[PDB]
Structure 1
């Protein structure tokens, strides 16, 4: 019949191919779908939801409930940092197991802005002011409010609104960043400081906690699907 010629790649199996194959159950009567709440169309829809950050991965606090709480007190004012965090959303131990980190560990490249939200869980009789800072890479990581004050920052005044949001904008030399620890695509640094101290009246707890969440903005994207290191196996079934 028709003369044909076979080309390279014949009789191979590529797991990413897209071809038609015969149906093993012809004329099957398929059940129709109903309207169920909670349909998802993109995986980036799940990365735009805030999830709590396990800041305190101490040897005695990790793998417990105490790892999500950051302790504050009414001590005299100091310029030392409250927490320090490197912007590696997929490889930082404190960011890799959040929902954003879990989704990023299935991909190789990411880009976009982030937002960190902090919530204060003290008494209504407590007051204070804090400083949340982000520093692009290249210089020494900030260790004093004096240095952190030179990068991007927000001043959080604790009142009726008990939450603050800080947006980390996209400041990169490449169009995408790798989801591993890398010097050429490092992200920067994040820290929290006391602007003033925490002040309480008598008959009030002098120690409190804050909680933190991270999520993505509407200009965030990923690419190059891959496999994760967060699940493994030794025996079949």
Structure 2
């Protein structure tokens, strides 16, 4: 285990801001989720936004995603990307939502997490039976929902194998999207994901999110 350059003194280290010690420090940064994965949106910024509108009917759905950290859409987030280099993962997740309507807009949403084994909720009535948050949009624009580590095992696979799936997140209208005159009846919501203090990754592996042909 010799050196090829004996007596070679290294160039002196200086202070550089932004030193990284572990990858979890990166996983704890709120990162956007490309929720709106349609053929018309996957090539542009719009993929990162969710549309909200004044509804005619009550208790309609806003959006729905899997919460398997290396599955779509989450796979392309910072956590998903880092997770793709590991086989096993554990610990709770944090999902944050930013409201980007007008200051004059009023809205209440239900954000809910459904454990595996039931399937995606078909109604707000079912969604409310899981882990949920009712979010009042006001002076504060961001709400966070923590998804607890509920599992039959200490670790789950990062591999999107239904067997170990962590379940789903859904969003439903609680009330409605209400606006005064001169305010748009539309709004957008921006979804983010980050790790909690207990989040861990284990058993490193090659990522399945990148290839090479030449």
Q: After TM superposition, what 4+ stretches of structure 1 lie above 4 angstroms from structure 2?
A: none
Give the aligned CA root-mean-square deviation in angstroms. Answer: 1.0
Q: What residue is the counterpart of 1:16 in the other structure?
A: none
Q: TM-score if structure 2 supplies the norm length?
A: 0.97
Alignment size in residue pairs: 214
Structure 1 position 86 matched with structure 2 position 66: yes
Unpaired runs of 5+ in structure 1?
Answer: 1-20
Question: Which shifted more, 205-214 or 21-30?
Answer: 21-30
Q: 1:108 aligns with which of 87, 109, 113?
A: 87
Larger RCO, structure (CA 8 Å, separation 6 or more): 2
* 8 Å CA contact 1:71, 1:210 repeated in 2: yes
Q: What residue is the counterpart of 1:141 in the other structure?
A: 120
Q: In 2, Cα distance between the equivalents of 1:158 and 1:229?
A: 38
**How far 1:140 moved relative to its partner?**
3.4
Q: In 1, Cα distance between the equivalents of 2:162 and 2:189?
A: 31
Report the structure, 1 or 2, having the larger strand content: 2
Report the structure, 1 or 2, having the larger helix content: 2
Q: How does 1:205-220 map to 2 (within 5 A)?
A: 205-220=184-199
CA deviation vs aligned residue, 1:30-88 (integer Å, no higher than 9, x gap): 21100110000001110000101100111111121111111111123422211111111
Structure 1 position 47 matched with structure 2 position 27: yes
* 8 Å CA contact 1:174, 1:185 repeated in 2: no
Counterpart of 2:81 in 1: which secondary structure? helix
Q: TM-score if structure 1 supplies the norm length?
A: 0.88
**How far 1:108 moved relative to its partner?**
0.3
* 8 Å CA contact 1:87, 1:188 repeated in 2: yes
